[PDB]
Amino acid sequence: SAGITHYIDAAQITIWAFWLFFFGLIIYLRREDKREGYPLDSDRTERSGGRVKVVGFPDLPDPKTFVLPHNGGTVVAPRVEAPVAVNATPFSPAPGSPLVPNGDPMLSGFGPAASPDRPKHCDLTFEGLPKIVPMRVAKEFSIAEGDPDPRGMTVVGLDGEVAGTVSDVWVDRSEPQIRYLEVEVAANKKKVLLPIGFSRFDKKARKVKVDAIKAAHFANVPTLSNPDQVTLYEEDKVCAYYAGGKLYATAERAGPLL
């Protein structure tokens, strides 16, 4: 099989078959793989591989037409995208070098806490009303018979010290699962959506610690336009912030340990 040609029969034909259509379908995927995010941006480096083709061996596929739900525009892919900003400076001009988050990184909106600008229209449910809503309109809901109700739990910074508390826990009409918790901060006396995904429950002390951002950062938390519902655009917006905390909230984190 590595030398060249030896035996000769039937079945050994077929092994060639599948193990051919594979190398075909493999490409199919390749293309289908490229839809979004393509083509690439800079020349910091070239395409690593056997045959360094212009931009990917599989010619970018064609536009795909996504017929969104009722009262919804139409999306396609590929679909040229408008270049974004880079609120950061390259630590080094060397291709592949990192970019430092100018000014306050916590909100500099970069890498550890960067994000795209998803549509500014609250994703709705099946018929019309918007999926993710606070337990306000989500009045037809009820805490899981048993699980200790989070409404009234005092959030606590990753620094430990308190940082506001909670309010409505944004449920969903699609799947009876909590996705967000209203956090009436302490200094802002405002409302900052808490991304359960980042919220660690401590049903023992009514607390809800979030090792993501210091207690103070709850003030710089992207504010919600409307409290009765959140749009995809911001759905990514609130999240991305805390995210940064993972590599910002402390000089320690970001920098290596050894």
């Binding site: 030896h6 995927l29 289908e32 996504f66 969104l68 994000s115 795209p116 998803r118 009876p176 699962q177």
Partner: protein, 319 residues
């Protein structure tokens, strides 16, 4: 120390959502959906209701029949003495017809119930694929399950109708019991060379691996970026976001190339289908084709060659 989406910490509930209504033909859904805090501490705690059309019943019926055969005949074995039935459970079973009636309808005894029961786990199984494509698109849904289901249902027939009946042998068709069935695969490997040498198996493996690999990655990946609605793929497929942003990027600066919250789900459905595909392949070749894959292999220059610290003799020659 961040809530790693393990078990939905605090849950919540709302009335029983009997899904999107169905057109003119899809009989009424049925069931008074229930909730289970436990089951729900992992997924959608609601239970049911479930549909049941014609094939729905028609298939289910053709289902709990073979069971009521492959189940009966089995109990009979340990002379209707359950106690042992309970003991020799994992051992029991129901064997196929004897090599004589190669294809002929086996008598009510000798491997008969198995051909009977078999065909009823031949239709109901095939009928349930209908209970898919049907209830599938009648949801306005395309067909990709229905598809795969075949790929799998293909292999199942490569272990029956298509090959066992293809070699004239109401025996060459797998038994009907955990252990014995666990033996058939064993027996097979032998009767014909040694499967580790039939590419289409050593192949179908890599897949059963990949799936064991990928749906194992993307399961994590999603989770990793499940905070950023990764789990919401649906929309991410349409309107991207930081999810598919952070994700794919990972694999980008990892294994280099990468893909999309869409693409992946592709390879997924593929590796999977491209599994049972390669399964039934070898299993089809192995039998009416090559008889000893070990010989095949080496005869093609495949099978390796090691030294020899031990060798034997051959009676049939010196004696």
């Amino acid at each position: 120390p961040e809530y790693q989406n393990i078990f939905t910490a605090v849950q919540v509930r709302a009335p029983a959502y009997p899904g999107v209504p169905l057109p003119k033909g899809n009989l009424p859904r049925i069931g008074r959906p229930i909730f289970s805090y436990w089951l729900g501490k992992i997924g959608d705690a609601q239970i049911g209701p479930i549909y049941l059309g014609l094939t729905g019943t028609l298939s289910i019926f053709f289902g709990l029949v073979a069971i009521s055969i492959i189940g009966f005949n089995m109990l009979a074995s340990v002379h209707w003495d359950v106690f042992q039935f309970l003991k020799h459970f994992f051992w029991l079973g129901l064997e196929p017809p004897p090599p004589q009636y190669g294809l002929r309808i086996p008598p009510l005894s000798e491997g008969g119930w198995w051909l009977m029961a078999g065909l009823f786990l031949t239709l109901s199984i095939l009928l349930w694929w209908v209970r898919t494509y049907k209830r599938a698109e009648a949801l306005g849904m395309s067909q990709h399950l229905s598809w795969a289901f075949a790929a799998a249902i293909f292999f199942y027939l490569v272990l029956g109708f298509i090959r066992p009946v293809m070699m004239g042998s109401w025996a060459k068709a797998v038994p009907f019991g955990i252990f014995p069935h666990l033996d058939w695969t064993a027996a097979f490997s032998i009767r014909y060379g040694n499967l580790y040498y039939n590419p289409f198996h050593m192949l179908s493996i890599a897949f059963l691996y990949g799936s064991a690999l990928l749906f194992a990655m993307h399961g994590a990946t999603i989770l990793s970026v499940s905070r950023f609605g990764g789990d919401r793929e649906i929309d991410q497929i349409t309107h991207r976001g930081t999810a598919a942003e952070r994700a794919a990027l990972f694999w980008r600066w990892t294994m280099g190339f990468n893909v999309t919250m869409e693409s992946i789900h592709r390879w997924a459905w593929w590796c999977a289908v491209l599994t049972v595909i390669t399964a039934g392949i070898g299993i089809l070749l192995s039998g009416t084709v090559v008889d000893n894959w070990y010989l095949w292999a080496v005869k093609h220059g495949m099978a390796p060659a090691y030294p020899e610290v031990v060798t034997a003799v051959n009676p049939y020659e010196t004696a």
